[PDB]
Amino acid sequence: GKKIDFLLSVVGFAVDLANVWRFPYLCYKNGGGAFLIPYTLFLIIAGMPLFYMELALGQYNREGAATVWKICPFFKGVGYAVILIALYVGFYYNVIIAWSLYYLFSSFTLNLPWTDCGHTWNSPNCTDPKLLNGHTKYSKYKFTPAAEFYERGVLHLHESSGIHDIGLPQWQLLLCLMVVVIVLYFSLWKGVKTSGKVVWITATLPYFVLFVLLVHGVTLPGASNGINAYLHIDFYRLKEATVWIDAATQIFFSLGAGFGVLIAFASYNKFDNNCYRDALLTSSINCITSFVSGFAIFSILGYMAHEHKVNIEDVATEGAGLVFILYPEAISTLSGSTFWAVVFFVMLLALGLDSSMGGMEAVITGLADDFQVLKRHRKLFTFGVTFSTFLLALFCITKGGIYVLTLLDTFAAGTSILFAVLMEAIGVSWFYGVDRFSNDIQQMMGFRPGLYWRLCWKFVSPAFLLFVVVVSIINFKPLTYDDYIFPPWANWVGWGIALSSMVLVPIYVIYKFLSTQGSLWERLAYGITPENEHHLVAQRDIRQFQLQHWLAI
Ligand SMILES: C[C@H](NC(C)(C)C)C(=O)c1cccc(Cl)c1
Numbered sequence: 001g002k003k004i005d006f007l008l009s010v011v012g013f014a015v016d017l018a019n020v021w022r023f024p025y026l027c028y029k030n031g032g033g034a035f036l037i038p039y040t041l042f043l044i045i046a047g048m049p050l051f052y053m054e055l056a057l058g059q060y061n062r063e064g065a066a067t068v069w070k071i072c073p074f075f076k077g078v079g080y081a082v083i084l085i086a087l088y089v090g091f092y093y094n095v096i097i098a099w100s101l102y103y104l105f106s107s108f109t110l111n112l113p114w115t116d117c118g119h120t121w122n123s124p125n126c127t128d129p130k131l132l133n134g135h136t137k138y139s140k141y142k143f144t145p146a147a148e149f150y151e152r153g154v155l156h157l158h159e160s161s162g163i164h165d166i167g168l169p170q171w172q173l174l175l176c177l178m179v180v181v182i183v184l185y186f187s188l189w190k191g192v193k194t195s196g197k198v199v200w201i202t203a204t205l206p207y208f209v210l211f212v213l214l215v216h217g218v219t220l221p222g223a224s225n226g227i228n229a230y231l232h233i234d235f236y237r238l239k240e241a242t243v244w245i246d247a248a249t250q251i252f253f254s255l256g257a258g259f260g261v262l263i264a265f266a267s268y269n270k271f272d273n274n275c276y277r278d279a280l281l282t283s284s285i286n287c288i289t290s291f292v293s294g295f296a297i298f299s300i301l302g303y304m305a306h307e308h309k310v311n312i313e314d315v316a317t318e319g320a321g322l323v324f325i326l327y328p329e330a331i332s333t334l335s336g337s338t339f340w341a342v343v344f345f346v347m348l349l350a351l352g353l354d355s356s357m358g359g360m361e362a363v364i365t366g367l368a369d370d371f372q373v374l375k376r377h378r379k380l381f382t383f384g385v386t387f388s389t390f391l392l393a394l395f396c397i398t399k400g401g402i403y404v405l406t407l408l409d410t411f412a413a414g415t416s417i418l419f420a421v422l423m424e425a426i427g428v429s430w431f432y433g434v435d436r437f438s439n440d441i442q443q444m445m446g447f448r449p450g451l452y453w454r455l456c457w458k459f460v461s462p463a464f465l466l467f468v469v470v471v472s473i474i475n476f477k478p479l480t481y482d483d484y485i486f487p488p489w490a491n492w493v494g495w496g497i498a499l500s501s502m503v504l505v506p507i508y509v510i511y512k513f514l515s516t517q518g519s520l521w522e523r524l525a526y527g528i529t530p531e532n533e534h535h536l537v538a539q540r541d542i543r544q545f546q547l548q549h550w551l552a553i
């Protein structure tokens with residue numbers, strides 16, 4: 001049964017709320033395969049090596065995201081940056097989980113609220129395909145019963161004029177978020193241990209849901225056109241860099257790299273655990289799952305396009321909520337729709353709780369390895385972190401909360417996470433030493449990494465990461481939500497949010513340089529040498545001050 005534990009771990013870590021909620025709308029907004037080509041390319045080239053590197057670092061050093069930088073003290077700033085990114089991304093993940101909980105609560109009925117309009121939340125402009133024969137010519141529709149429900153009875157978005165009029169928190173999403181927060185705190189207040197029990201059903205269910213989605217949606221009146229549009233590549237779309245930026249960000253979202261979660265999780269792994277097999281299996285399963293999810297999503301929205309007599313590009317929204325408009329629509333066409341709705345939204349709740357727990361545990365471990373006081377008081381520290389997250393998510397459940405959620409989803413971990421991962425790779429590979437990293441991996445697992453891994457770690461991955469980071473800055477599209485154009489100050493606030501975590505690296509480098517005592521060269525030596533080898537500095541034996549270290553692969 002040794003292989004069973006391994007397989008369970010890899011399947012559980014290979015599926016995330018990212019793959020199930022963020023990948024659908026990114027794939028739909030970016031062509032639908034013109035997004036997969038960059039996705040697969042980046043997956044291999046950058047995601048596999050960086051996932052492997054993070055796992056190996058966490059395993060060997062036995063430290064969290066922040067404290068693992070005792071190998072190179074100058075990058076504790078990068079550690080703090082990834083911790084802050086994980087904290088930022090934890091303000092709207094809980095809001096998404098609250099939406100899932102609300103949908104699950106609404107699913108306990110024999111007449112689902114998203115099947116037709118005629119309720120209190122339905123506008124006069126609703127069009128029901130079943131109650132009638134069947135437009136702005138470029139809009140995102142918004143007049144379907146499912147979209148009407150999502151945007152009026154759940155978000156109450158019709159009571160906000162923009163991000164400048166967010167309003168007051170909704171008292172229903174308020175209770176949902178309170179329940180989610182309480183569950184997270186009570187699942188994180190005792191310790192890191194949560195595996196080897198009920199996590200069995202939080203990893204198998206997503207695959208069953210995806211499988212049933214495929215088998216059913218393949219046989220739909222309009223799924224053929226959706227599949228055809230999915231399998232058509234538009235290279236003029238590939239010549240824009242928006243798809244490339246989205247692919248990189250979604251990759252680092254789904255694989256978990258750049259959030260400090262992998263390092264913290266691996267810090268508890270057995271010293272002789274195989275990170276290479278972990279990386280290979282997780283990446284392969286992630287790629288296959290992403291392809292299948294794209295196929296199912298495009299089949300469903302092709303069916304919608306056939307049902308609403310609307311072009312495929314206008315059936316559904318291109319932002320957060322695409323899954324909440326899609327899955328109800330597909331469920332309404334299944335026999336016994338109530339059971340399937342319950343199962344689907346229970347799966348969404350389980351996945352979201354698992355992901356939120358992972359991120360919160362990453363933050364807590366990163367900040368607790370640094371300070372012993374917080375380690376001795378896990379309960380109070382967890383309560384404080386959870387309360388802060390609860391308030392900053394309260395900010396995102398207002399009437400105009402979708403605008404804030406879009407701003408965060410766009411700016412919290414975009415160029416910021418790309419820069420953090422680039423700095424991690426540069427730090428390790430160049431300053432600490434790819435040769436030293438390979439020696440550590442050999443000491444741990446028994447075999448030295450191949451040439452492909454070393455080349456990707458040292459040259460290729462940093463190069464493409466830097467290219468994407470530069471392109472995402474020189475080619476920045478002002479934020480928008482469907483047909484709503486954010487005001488310029490919203491863009492300024494988003495860029496400030498990104499910089500808040502991007503600037504911790506140079507600030508910490510400056511702080512470390514000033515704090516250390518000695519001359520310039522001595523300060524540099526203490527700054528780039530591992531903490532446990534500071535005795536060599538007095539002997540004037542620094543490897544980084546030799547060309548052999550820099551010209552070694
Ligand atoms: C991407 C991450 N999940 C892993 C690392 C892939 C397991 C996640 O969903 C997350 C990241 C930061 C904060 C919060 Cl709340 C959630």
Ligand SMILES: [Cl-]
Pocket residue numbers: 018019023250251254290
């Ligand atoms: Cl993904």
